[PDB]
């Protein structure tokens, strides 16, 4: 834990779209900080009263 979860080359990690992702590479998972005003898991809907 943060040791290997670094800031997400994004390639593959689309995962999230509009989301600055944390690349848990210790289970090699995405998890997502959705950009201010977004929602969704693959961080792609715009929370429109966003």
Do not use: I, M, W
Not at 29 to 50: I, Q
């Amino acid at each position: 834990v943060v040791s290997h979860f670094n800031d997400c080359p994004d390639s593959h990690t689309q995962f999230c779209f509009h989301g600055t992702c944390r690349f848990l590479v210790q289970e090699d998972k995405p998890a997502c900080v959705c950009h201010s005003g977004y929602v969704g898991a693959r961080c792609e809907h715009a929370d429109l009263l966003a």
